[PDB]
Design a binder for this molecule. Structure first.
Ligand SMILES: CC(C)CCC[C@@H](C)[C@H]1CC[C@H]2[C@@H]3CC=C4C[C@@H](O)CC[C@]4(C)[C@H]3CC[C@]12C
Ligand SMILES: CC(C)CCC[C@@H](C)[C@H]1CC[C@H]2[C@@H]3CC=C4C[C@@H](O)CC[C@]4(C)[C@H]3CC[C@]12C
Ligand SMILES: CCCCCCCC/C=C\CCCCCCCC(=O)OC[C@H](O)CO
Ligand SMILES: CCCCCCCC/C=C\CCCCCCCC(=O)OC[C@H](O)CO
Ligand SMILES: CCCCCCCC/C=C\CCCCCCCC(=O)OC[C@H](O)CO
Ligand SMILES: CCCCCCCC/C=C\CCCCCCCC(=O)OC[C@H](O)CO
Ligand SMILES: CCS(=O)(=O)N1CCC[C@@H]2CN3CCc4cc(OC)ccc4[C@H]3C[C@@H]21
Ligand SMILES: CCS(=O)(=O)N1CCC[C@@H]2CN3CCc4cc(OC)ccc4[C@H]3C[C@@H]21
Ligand SMILES: CCCCCCCC/C=C\CCCCCCCC(=O)O
Ligand SMILES: CCCCCCCC/C=C\CCCCCCCC(=O)O
Lengths: 474, 472
């Protein structure tokens, strides 16, 4: 028998902490599976990647972690040649699937914010099951289990070839880290530009005045009569916010007999040529109130809770905050079916015109007038309800994405010492070999990562916290 | 005579990573020093501890860290017997001073939490600078044994079984016990929720004109416009002081000035005062007694429509009603008791004496005198004084949190080594963690010196804003 490097005390001690770890990883991750499959707030199809990731951790804990310790403590591989090959393939496989899982999850967070409309109709359990199958096959192809292995008292070790060490470090850690970084870099640019609405500020917290009363007060303050009001804010530009589409549509409306029934409040100081076209229409028509001034947030909220409709005629609008904050106060949007406006507005919450054509806009303003004569009271409440529901949906999804970045960062920091050390040995071998005891500790920090995701979810997410509390405490 | 384990390449790579780490630790912690000694957000005296703790971590990077690595790579102590004793003495002192600093900070937050106002005036820069020396001295009485025990060409530390075990308890486990127990008391008073929800109680969240809001409110009650006074809370003799207001209304009702005034009194509980209020509501179609539980949003609307908020409290330690009322624009008429006397000044509101209805009726009659002219400046003084209190509490709330993280991170960094060193003292080669792993463990320890400026950037907005102001 080979002399062991571990005393009885060290064996009992190490088997106890690792024993503790295995149990902690299993119950925690089993609880994650349970939370996703039971919690209403967590039963979304994209959350199945977390179920699949939890299993990768449950199986390192049961199929790999005990043999890593037993092999260490014993100074030899006792479990036979067959289980050596299966143990080595899995160890690499389960490590590799966490890497590929974090790439799949990252992309899913990226496309949900960017391609919100198109992507979410593809966020189906069957489609998610297809991607989880794909991550597992990519993890098997990357891991390539058929050749990982290779004796008086036998040993169980990996292939020592240079091309292999490096191929496997890149495929299983360095390239998945490059993908995750790049995707999360693209997520934090979008998250910075598509900032969430001031939920508390954009609300009719007056609970004092009436809609028709606020409208009459507003239209008297500007210098008009009581009628169907239309309103524009934002930069005066042909390239994006599309003020030109509205000014041209008003020129089409002026030639009509229904122009007298309509009131228009245009705002912006973007283009000198467009400002002139705007104020010339204010000079030519008394139904037009052009305000080139910079109106404070306090003034625009007063405007939204008075005007019947808000015209958002953008060529490109990735978020459409103006639509959301306007809908919260009761203004019915008339927007171009572009980017973020296509996502927010429904049949019950507004009118979606085609971007660029003023004839498309003018015809909608006429349709708006036809709807105005009847009970607009219930149509305005669908706008208020949608704006809140969409905003709270996006705030909580923006939060879930952050938690998932924490999951990704903690994984990268847990495996970096090992992969950095294993890569160096692949390169300079002996001249840069991390000592045996440090190398061993480095892949144990790696194994410890399997127990961490359930702590991250608990700490950073209320829905997993509540699910865990409901199971654990009654 | 002996040659190192480290090849020419390793030496170069290791010197570059320790080299980088030393530079990172120095610039980062130097940035913490400048941040506390320049930013008005960090001009609170308690922050000076983080300048002394930044100084500790700079000295680690500069005076001990190059020698730890130099000694390692070289396989012996090249620098001589005198620098061996100073290097070892300092290396232990900077580790203990970090543990003791985190006992001084932990205990500072505890007195901040326990004795709220009396031991807040005590926190002075000259008082804190004395604690910084107290902690630096205590650190020496721990690092360098009072038993005038020796620390021990190699450069080893004293190997005696009892120096090993007493030193781990003194520099790590005892300060880890203090930190934990003190923060156990801290998070026990954190559940009080004594913080003003400024993310809600803000007149910015209200829409329309305040005059138009006060008109519509009175219109809902079917009342004519006039100087609207409000009382909020429960109906009881003591704490709230409903009995001081109902009796104060009786002095005013017997005067031609009551005509002008309007009352929105909100109380629930015992029918003794409730019957007295309802009778005054039946007697005067000018007073409106509300008993039912009112929504958090409707109170925000009342604070932002009514002219004055009456707080006739006998005992009021915090005075949140006043802070919530002030943040909405309402001018308070409150008794100068506990917290109210600490919030309301001469320019913000009207302070009185608890228990006298004649003094409160006189204050209500002074409120009516004031309302006849523009009150807008008083309200702008009300919001200004109350929001400065909410930011002072939030700055204290964050600071206590960011420092639970610093302490938590320090323990995780030193636990591997201090547990390893302790085990060794007990069972020696029977539980000796391997040479390389033991050496890495104290380098995890040395890495903690660069982490603190990263912890502040991430978790404290004031330091993040300060570091952006220095570096751009
Ligand atoms: C839930 C988590 C955070 C628990 C953490 C358990 C940690 C402390 C345990 C789990 C497995 C352990 C390792 C198992 C094997 C070895 C090899 C031996 O030659 C030195 C100790 C070392 C390197 C152990 C160090 C401590 C270790 C990493
Ligand atoms: C910017 C900061 C946070 C980077 C952190 C620096 C880390 C990675 C550095 C600092 C000092 C280094 C250690 C110095 C000494 C030894 C002992 C040797 O037998 C193995 C390598 C080992 C254990 C090094 C590993 C890496 C190390 C711990
Ligand atoms: C029969 C399978 C259908 C059950 C759907 C499910 O919720 O489970 C998916 C699985 O957890 C994904 O790894
Ligand atoms: C070796 C390993 C190679 C892995 C292959 C990599 C990527 C293919 C998977 C990406 C799937 C591409 C579809 C993109 C998508 O669905 O988003 C579009 C959006 O929803 C608007 O319709
Ligand atoms: C060897 C090359 C490294 C490949 C890295 C794997 C990235 C997998 C990402 C997405 C698949 C799921 C959609
Ligand atoms: C967490 C920090 C330390 C715990 C590690 C303590 C482990 C103590 C056992 C050390 C030991 O005796 O191990 C022999 C060595 O592995 C021969 O190569
Ligand atoms: C001490 C022998 S050993 O150092 O050779 N060894 C076999 C036992 C487990 C240990 C850690 N795990 C984590 C994942 C993983 C991923 C890889 O990328 C493909 C490559 C190896 C490792 C393995 C293998 C390690
Ligand atoms: C392997 C040599 S050694 O093990 O003997 N050694 C000398 C070099 C530094 C190393 C780490 N530092 C951190 C602070 C520190 C605090 C203590 O608590 C009082 C006790 C020792 C340590 C030292 C000493 C270590
Ligand atoms: C006073 C410290 C508190 C101890 C409990 C927490 C320790 C858990 C972390 C690492 C332990 C690793 C196992 C090392 C012990 C081996 C047993 C032995 O020494 O004989
Ligand atoms: C907070 C502590 C930081 C922990 C991160 C660990 C990352 C270090 C990883 C690998 C170290 C590489 C050193 C290789 C040179 C040593 C070779 C030799 O001993 O001859």
């Amino acid at each position: 028998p080979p002399r062991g490097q571990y005393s009885a005390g060290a064996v009992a001690g190490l088997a106890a902490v690792v024993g503790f770890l295995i149990v902690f990883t299993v119950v925690g991750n089993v609880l994650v599976v349970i939370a996703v499959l039971t919690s209403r707030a967590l039963r979304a199809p994209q959350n199945l990647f977390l179920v699949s990731l939890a299993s990768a951790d449950i199986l390192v804990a049961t199929l790999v972690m005990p043999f890593s310790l037993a092999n260490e403590l014993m100074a030899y591989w006792y479990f036979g040649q067959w289980w050596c090959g299966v143990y080595l393939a899995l160890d690499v496989l389960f490590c590799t699937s966490s890497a590929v899982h974090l790439c799949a999850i990252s992309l899913d967070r990226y496309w949900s914010v960017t391609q919100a409309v198109e992507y979410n109709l593809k966020r189906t359990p069957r489609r998610v099951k297809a991607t989880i199958v794909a991550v597992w096959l990519i993890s098997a192809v990357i891991s390539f289990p058929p050749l990982v292995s290779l004796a008086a008292y036998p040993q169980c070790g990996l292939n020592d070839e240079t091309w292999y060490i490096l191929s496997s470090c890149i495929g299983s850690f360095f390239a998945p880290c490059l993908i995750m970084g790049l995707v999360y870099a693209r997520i934090y640019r979008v998250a910075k530009l598509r900032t969430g609405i001031d939920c508390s500020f954009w609300n009719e917290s007056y609970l004092t005045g009436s809609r028709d009363e606020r409208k009459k007060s507003l239209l008297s303050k500007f210098g008009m009569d009581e009628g169907v009001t239309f309103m524009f804010i934002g930069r005066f530009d042909r390239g994006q916010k599309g003020v030109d589409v509205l000014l041209k549509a008003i020129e089409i409306l002026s030639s009509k007999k229904e122009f007298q029934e309509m009131r228009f409040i245009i705002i912006g100081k973007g283009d000198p040529e467009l400002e002139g076209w705007a104020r010339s229409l204010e000079e030519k028509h008394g139904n037009v109130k052009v305000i080139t001034e910079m109106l404070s947030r306090e003034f625009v909220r007063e405007l939204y809770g008075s005007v019947d409709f808000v015209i958002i005629p953008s060529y490109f609008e990735p978020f459409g905050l103006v639509a959301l904050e306007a809908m919260c106060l009761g203004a019915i949007p008339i927007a171009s079916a572009v980017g973020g406006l296509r996502d927010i507005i429904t049949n019950e919450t507004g009118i979606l015109v085609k971007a660029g054509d003023p004839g498309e806009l003018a015809n909608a303003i006429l349709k708006a007038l036809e709807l105005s004569r009847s009970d607009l009271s219930k149509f305005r409440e669908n706008c208020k309800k949608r704006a809140m529901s969409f905003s709270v949906a996006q705030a909580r999804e923006k939060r879930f994405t952050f938690v998932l970045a924490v999951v990704m960062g903690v994984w990268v920091l847990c495996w970096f010492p090992f992969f950095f050390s294993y890569s160096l040995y692949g390169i300079c071998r002996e001249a840069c070999q991390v000592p045996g005891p440090l190398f061993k500790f480095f892949f144990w920090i790696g194994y410890c990562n399997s127990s961490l995701n359930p702590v991250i979810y608990t700490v950073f997410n209320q829905d997993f916290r509540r699910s865990f509390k409901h199971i654990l405490f009654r």
